Write a protein that binds this ligand. Structure first.
Ligand SMILES: [Pb+2]
Length: 9
């Protein structure tokens, strides 16, 4: 989940 947020942004 954490990585998905950073990736998206
Ligand atoms: Pb990525």
């Amino acid at each position: 989940l954490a990585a998905s947020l950073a990736c998206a942004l």
